[PDB]
Amino acid sequence: PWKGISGSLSRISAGSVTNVWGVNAANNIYRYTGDDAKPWVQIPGALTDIGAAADGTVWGVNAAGNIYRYVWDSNHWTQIKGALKRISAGSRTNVWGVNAGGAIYRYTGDDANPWVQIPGVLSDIGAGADGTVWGVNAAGEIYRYTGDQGDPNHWVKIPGALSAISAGIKTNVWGVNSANNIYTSTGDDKNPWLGIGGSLVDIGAGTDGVVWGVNAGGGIYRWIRD
Amino acid sequence: PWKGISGSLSRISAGSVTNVWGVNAANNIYRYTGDDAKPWVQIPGALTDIGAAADGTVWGVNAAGNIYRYVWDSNHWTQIKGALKRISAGSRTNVWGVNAGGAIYRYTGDDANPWVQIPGVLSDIGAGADGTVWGVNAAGEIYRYTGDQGDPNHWVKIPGALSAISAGIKTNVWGVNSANNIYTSTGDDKNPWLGIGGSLVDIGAGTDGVVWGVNAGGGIYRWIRD
Amino acid sequence: PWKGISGSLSRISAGSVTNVWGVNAANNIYRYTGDDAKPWVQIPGALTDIGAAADGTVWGVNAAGNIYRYVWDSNHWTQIKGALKRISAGSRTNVWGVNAGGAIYRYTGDDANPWVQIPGVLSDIGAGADGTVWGVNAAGEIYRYTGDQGDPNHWVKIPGALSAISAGIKTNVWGVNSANNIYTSTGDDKNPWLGIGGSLVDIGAGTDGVVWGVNAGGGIYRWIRD
Amino acid sequence: PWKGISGSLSRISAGSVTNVWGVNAANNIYRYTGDDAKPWVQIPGALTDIGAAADGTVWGVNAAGNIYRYVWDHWTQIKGALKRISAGSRTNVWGVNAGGAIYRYTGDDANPWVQIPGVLSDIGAGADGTVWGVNAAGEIYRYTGDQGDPHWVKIPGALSAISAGIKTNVWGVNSANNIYTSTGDDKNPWLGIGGSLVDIGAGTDGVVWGVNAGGGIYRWIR
Numbered sequence: 001p002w003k004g005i006s007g008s009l010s011r012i013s014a015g016s017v018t019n020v021w022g023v024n025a026a027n028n029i030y031r032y033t034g035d036d037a038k039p040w041v042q043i044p045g046a047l048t049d050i051g052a053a054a055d056g057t058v059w060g061v062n063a064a065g066n067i068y069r070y071v072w073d074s075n076h077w078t079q080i081k082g083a084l085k086r087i088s089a090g091s092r093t094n095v096w097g098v099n100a101g102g103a104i105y106r107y108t109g110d111d112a113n114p115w116v117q118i119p120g121v122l123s124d125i126g127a128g129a130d131g132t133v134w135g136v137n138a139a140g141e142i143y144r145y146t147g148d149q150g151d152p153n154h155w156v157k158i159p160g161a162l163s164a165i166s167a168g169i170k171t172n173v174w175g176v177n178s179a180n181n182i183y184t185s186t187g188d189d190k191n192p193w194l195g196i197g198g199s200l201v202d203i204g205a206g207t208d209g210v211v212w213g214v215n216a217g218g219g220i221y222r223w224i225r226d
Numbered sequence: 227p228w229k230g231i232s233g234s235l236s237r238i239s240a241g242s243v244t245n246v247w248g249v250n251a252a253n254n255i256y257r258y259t260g261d262d263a264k265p266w267v268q269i270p271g272a273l274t275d276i277g278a279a280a281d282g283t284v285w286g287v288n289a290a291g292n293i294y295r296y297v298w299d300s301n302h303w304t305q306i307k308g309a310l311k312r313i314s315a316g317s318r319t320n321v322w323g324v325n326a327g328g329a330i331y332r333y334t335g336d337d338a339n340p341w342v343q344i345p346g347v348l349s350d351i352g353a354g355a356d357g358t359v360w361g362v363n364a365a366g367e368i369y370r371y372t373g374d375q376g377d378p379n380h381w382v383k384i385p386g387a388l389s390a391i392s393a394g395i396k397t398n399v400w401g402v403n404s405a406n407n408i409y410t411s412t413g414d415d416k417n418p419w420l421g422i423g424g425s426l427v428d429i430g431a432g433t434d435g436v437v438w439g440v441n442a443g444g445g446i447y448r449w450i451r452d
Numbered sequence: 453p454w455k456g457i458s459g460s461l462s463r464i465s466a467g468s469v470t471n472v473w474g475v476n477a478a479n480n481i482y483r484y485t486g487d488d489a490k491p492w493v494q495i496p497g498a499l500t501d502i503g504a505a506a507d508g509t510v511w512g513v514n515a516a517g518n519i520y521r522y523v524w525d526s527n528h529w530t531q532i533k534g535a536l537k538r539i540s541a542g543s544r545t546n547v548w549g550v551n552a553g554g555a556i557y558r559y560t561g562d563d564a565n566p567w568v569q570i571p572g573v574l575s576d577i578g579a580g581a582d583g584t585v586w587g588v589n590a591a592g593e594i595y596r597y598t599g600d601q602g603d604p605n606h607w608v609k610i611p612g613a614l615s616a617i618s619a620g621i622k623t624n625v626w627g628v629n630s631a632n633n634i635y636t637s638t639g640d641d642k643n644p645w646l647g648i649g650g651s652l653v654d655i656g657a658g659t660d661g662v663v664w665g666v667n668a669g670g671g672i673y674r675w676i677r678d
Numbered sequence: 679p680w681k682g683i684s685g686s687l688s689r690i691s692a693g694s695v696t697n698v699w700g701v702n703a704a705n706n707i708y709r710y711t712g713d714d715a716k717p718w719v720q721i722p723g724a725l726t727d728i729g730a731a732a733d734g735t736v737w738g739v740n741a742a743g744n745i746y747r748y749v750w751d752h753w754t755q756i757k758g759a760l761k762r763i764s765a766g767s768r769t770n771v772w773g774v775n776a777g778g779a780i781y782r783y784t785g786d787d788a789n790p791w792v793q794i795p796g797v798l799s800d801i802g803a804g805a806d807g808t809v810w811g812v813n814a815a816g817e818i819y820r821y822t823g824d825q826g827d828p829h830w831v832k833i834p835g836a837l838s839a840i841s842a843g844i845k846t847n848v849w850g851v852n853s854a855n856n857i858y859t860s861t862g863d864d865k866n867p868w869l870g871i872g873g874s875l876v877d878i879g880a881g882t883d884g885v886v887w888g889v890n891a892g893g894g895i896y897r898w899i900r
């Protein structure tokens with residue numbers, strides 16, 4: 001079930017139990033501390049979406065579409081040229097975004113030439129440490145990336161409808177639909193989703209299995225198995 | 227202690243908290259969902275043993291000795307030539323089996339030429355993500371693989387008796403004996419086993435520390451530390 | 453909060469949930485079993501500090517300054533030439549120590565020529581699986597290693613005062629001050645520490661998020677998030 | 679077998695599915711985009727060998743022997759001279775120089791290399807600490823200098839290029855261009871894999887990429 005955690009957030013991303021970040025409605029940025037008694041520390045800056053990876057990589061975008069990577073020093077963030085609306089970092093080497101037109105981009109590893117457009121149209125995306133990438137489009141159709149596995153069409157459609165998706169590793173894929181219903185991937189593409197009790201508007205599914213979410217009213221939860 | 231989980235299984239393998247599979251007595255295949263309220267989803271096919279790795283690799287064998295690897299798409303399984311009785315996958319690159327004659331094989335990474343025989347005789351085997359491999363023979367003697375570390379005899383005998391063994395990583399080795407008594411490796415080859423309260427016929431020890439087991443009556447348990 | 457664990461230890465190191473070692477005041481060596489009902493097994497030998505990594509690497513030093521690496525066989529330990537007072541192993545490839553004069557050394561991977569001196573003076577050090585290295589000096593000043601990232605001064609000073617530090621991965625850094633007060637890194641170098649309720653003299657912060665500590669009276673604790 | 683990926687390269691390294699780099703004959707540097715349809719982006723600079731790690735680490739050497747580490751913001755020169763280089767991770771970086779002496783990165787940019795006893799012409803360094811090498815003559819060695827062997831153990835066979843992503847993912851080519859992968863059995867160490875290649879890069883996650891004499895690029899399809 002979900003454990004309620006104090007605080008208020010609008011979006012959230014979890015790469016591992018030790019690297020969990022979110023933004024609130026005012027665009028303040030927070031990082032989870034590891035202590036549920038005082039779970040959040042505000043990190044300076046302003047973001048509207050964030051992607052945090054198991055390896056410590058953190059990327060964000062702001063209201064204007066400006067893109068940032070955390071540099072783990074007193075400068076805090078560095079702006080990376082281009083414009084994005086949503087972003088997910090599975091690792092240093094697997095960072096993806098969606099711009100305001102729905103175009104899909106992948107970080108090239110070159111800050112001087114940082115993005116290559118990957119064919120397709122999405123509204124949210126979730127990238128993993130192992131190369132896993134899932135997305136959803138504005139109508140809720142769900143896709144898994146195949147463009148690095150020889151598929152000239154780049155994406156395979158997986159049945160169902162979701163509005164937010166996260167995939168920190170191949171085996172930890174979660175999403176929510178437009179009515180806030182929570183789902184997790186079964187690993188069977190022909191019976192792909194299990195409904196999970198609860199209600200969320202965004203979700204972050206980590207490489208080590210950690211799952212965090214936020215609901216419509218800004219309430220924050222972590223998934224508890226044991 | 228052990229947390230009882232609903233369902234009924236005959237064998238089980240855990241590569242990580244997010245990749246846990248089992249088979250029941252009817253040879254139905256199940257994958258753990260991450261929700262203990264509804265812990266299992268049946269995956270189509272029929273298997274008598276399964277090996278699931280932290281990296282998502284899943285291998286199985288059926289009653290006839292047919293060998294399969296999960297392809298994480300709508301085809302579900304692909305049959306790999308050869309015949310095995312027991313199988314363990316520590317990773318994509320560390321997959322081992324034992325055939326009905328007790329001969330030991332290692333997956334070569336070439337589906338057209340998939341197995342090389344490794345000297346020795348075993349009845350169960352457990353392979354890890356870091357290359358770790360342990361086995362037991364029909365009389366219960368316990369061995370750890372040394373054939374990739376210069377040892378011309380391939381295996382070092384470790385004192386004790388076990389009938390099932392699992393080793394998802396060097397530091398997470400568990401087994402059961404023929405009387406269903408549970409043991410975990412101490413890491414001291416001269417005092418190698420600690421008895422653990424409980425009773426199990428098969429056990430799966432994951433790379434991230436997760437431990438699952440099944441008992442003689444098909445009852446399922448996950449190890450809880452906290 | 454902290455879960456009390458039975459036993460008595462003077463120092464402790466945790467690389468992952470499955471690789472946690474400590475030494476007691478008599479210099480006996482123990483490894484955590486994974487069962488809190490019987491949490492420790494004594495490993496033969498005598499050490500005054502130990503460093504245990506996620507990948508299974510374990511290094512120690514004894515009262516005389518002798519340095520040892522665990523060989524995961526019936527020989528138990530191998531002595532490595534040189535003299536150290538404190539040691540930390542983040543991985544097989546990231547092992548650091550501090551000698552009795554405060555000089556800082558890094559394991560070269562060559563047992564015949566095992567140490568290179570890294571400029572600076574420390575009293576405790578903590579190394580990670582991802583290359584992360586933090587240290588503190590005798591006055592409590594805190595430093596993070598930058599000498600493999602182009603910095604000719606080798607260390608960046610981070611505000612605060614600590615007497616023991618551990619850093620199993622970039623995102624899991626913990627320390628204690630000389631008054632036994634516990635702190636964890638926020639990831640903001642300008643607001644770097646969060647106070648954690650409790651009292652400890654040594655702490656081990658694992659690559660997978662596990663955190664163990666020992667207090668002044670030898671009492672042992674594991675950090676619990678859920 | 680192998681899937682042909684468009685382009686042409688002379689040397690290649692894969693640390694993981696998502697970190698694959700190569701250089702072409704002209705010494706132009708390329709990184710795999712993750713899009714098989716538009717598979718390469720050129721990275722500024724000139725190199726003759728490159729090593730890419732699972733954690734994103736990238737090191738290279740130029741024709742002259744200058745050594746560079748990629749900075750992910752393009753290249754910083756690190757003091758010394760090397761002819762080949764491999765990086766399994768930030769903390770496991772090895773190379774050989776033109777005369778065949780073997781070096782490992784110290785983790786100290788101001789004092790960056792320590793020489794390791796022996797003679798090699800290619801080397802593969804893994805994320806888990808695994809190091810394999812081949813000598814001019816084609817003899818194959820695995821490193822044991824960090825586990826009590828006063829350094830290298832010879833494994834039978836002959837190879838001209840070698841790559842190790844992990845203890846369990848080791849590949850090489852012989853001078854005839856035959857491809858081999860390590861079996862995990864020192865007494866029967868090699869399995870021949872169908873095809874012909876001149877360089878190969880093997881990742882920790884099982885990823886394997888290669889280039890043939892003519893510059894054709896291939897990814898192994900398990």
Ligand SMILES: C=CCO[C@H]1O[C@H](CO)[C@@H](OC)[C@H](O)[C@@H]1O
Pocket residue numbers: 081082083084099100103105115
């Ligand atoms: C702002 C610079 C150019 O913009 C276009 O190309 C860039 C990529 O070069 C996009 O940024 C990711 C942006 O969203 C848009 O599609």
Ligand SMILES: C=CCO[C@H]1O[C@H](CO)[C@@H](OC)[C@H](O)[C@@H]1O
Pocket residue numbers: 119120121122135137141143153154155
């Ligand atoms: C008609 C096909 C092209 O676009 C469609 O398919 C592509 C994928 O092929 C989607 O991009 C992810 C897009 O959202 C849409 O559903």
Ligand SMILES: C=CCO[C@H]1O[C@H](CO)[C@@H](OC)[C@H](O)[C@@H]1O
Pocket residue numbers: 159160161162177178181183193
């Ligand atoms: C029309 C059938 C599917 O709709 C429902 O069930 C499916 C799951 O089977 C959801 O897809 C993820 C969808 O969002 C919705 O809740």
Ligand SMILES: C=CCO[C@H]1O[C@H](CO)[C@@H](OC)[C@H](O)[C@@H]1O
Pocket residue numbers: 307308309310325326329331341
């Ligand atoms: C079924 C094909 C040939 O069988 C023999 O060799 C193969 C290996 O080539 C074995 O399969 C693993 C099988 O068990 C047996 O020993």
Ligand SMILES: C=CCO[C@H]1O[C@H](CO)[C@@H](OC)[C@H](O)[C@@H]1O
Pocket residue numbers: 345346347348361363367369379380381
């Ligand atoms: C007499 C030695 C050969 O076989 C024995 O030793 C080998 C190992 O050397 C065992 O194989 C794992 C086998 O089960 C048996 O115990």
Ligand SMILES: C=CCO[C@H]1O[C@H](CO)[C@@H](OC)[C@H](O)[C@@H]1O
Pocket residue numbers: 385386387388403404407409419
């Ligand atoms: C005869 C002494 C050993 O037997 C018992 O204890 C040992 C453990 O010390 C078990 O070995 C794993 C064995 O299965 C049995 O339960």
Ligand SMILES: C=CCO[C@H]1O[C@H](CO)[C@@H](OC)[C@H](O)[C@@H]1O
Pocket residue numbers: 533534535536551552555557567
């Ligand atoms: C004991 C051998 C030589 O000692 C000196 O150099 C060695 C390093 O070569 C140090 O051991 C780490 C020791 O502490 C001292 O500084």
Ligand SMILES: C=CCO[C@H]1O[C@H](CO)[C@@H](OC)[C@H](O)[C@@H]1O
Pocket residue numbers: 571572573574587589593595605606607
């Ligand atoms: C005056 C500077 C040299 O030493 C100081 O700085 C160095 C770091 O530059 C410290 O070493 C870690 C040392 O402890 C001390 O604080």
Ligand SMILES: C=CCO[C@H]1O[C@H](CO)[C@@H](OC)[C@H](O)[C@@H]1O
Pocket residue numbers: 611612613614629630633635645
């Ligand atoms: C003088 C101000 C700082 O001192 C206190 O707070 C700081 C934390 O802000 C501690 O630094 C880690 C220090 O040890 C002490 O407890």
Ligand SMILES: C=CCO[C@H]1O[C@H](CO)[C@@H](OC)[C@H](O)[C@@H]1O
Pocket residue numbers: 684685686687702703706708718
């Ligand atoms: C057909 C295009 C010419 O190939 C050029 O660009 C390609 C990349 O588009 C290079 O392949 C890696 C090739 O080496 C050369 O520089």
Ligand SMILES: C=CCO[C@H]1O[C@H](CO)[C@@H](OC)[C@H](O)[C@@H]1O
Pocket residue numbers: 722723724725740741744746753
């Ligand atoms: C001086 C700039 C152009 O090339 C030089 O520097 C670049 C790096 O800036 C090297 O490429 C990696 C190249 O080999 C050469 O040494």
Ligand SMILES: C=CCO[C@H]1O[C@H](CO)[C@@H](OC)[C@H](O)[C@@H]1O
Pocket residue numbers: 757758759760775776779781791
């Ligand atoms: C200037 C020093 C001479 O360089 C020697 O040692 C250096 C390292 O100190 C080597 O670079 C790796 C170089 O190849 C050569 O053997």
Ligand SMILES: C=CCO[C@H]1O[C@H](CO)[C@@H](OC)[C@H](O)[C@@H]1O
Pocket residue numbers: 795796797798813814817819830
């Ligand atoms: C005493 C032997 C010196 O060199 C031989 O053995 C060494 C290894 O001991 C090789 O270096 C890796 C070298 O290439 C050669 O085969």
Ligand SMILES: C=CCO[C@H]1O[C@H](CO)[C@@H](OC)[C@H](O)[C@@H]1O
Pocket residue numbers: 834835836837852853856858868
């Ligand atoms: C003695 C056998 C001849 O060696 C052949 O096969 C071996 C492997 O058995 C190759 O070594 C990797 C070698 O290059 C050659 O092709």
Ligand SMILES: C=CCO[C@H]1O[C@H](CO)[C@@H](OC)[C@H](O)[C@@H]1O
Pocket residue numbers: 679680872873874875890891894896
């Ligand atoms: C056409 C089959 C034989 O070789 C061709 O294709 C193979 C791959 O199918 C290449 O080996 C990797 C080889 O270099 C060549 O390009």
Ligand SMILES: [Mg+2]
Pocket residue numbers: 012013050087088125126165166203
């Ligand atoms: Mg997101």
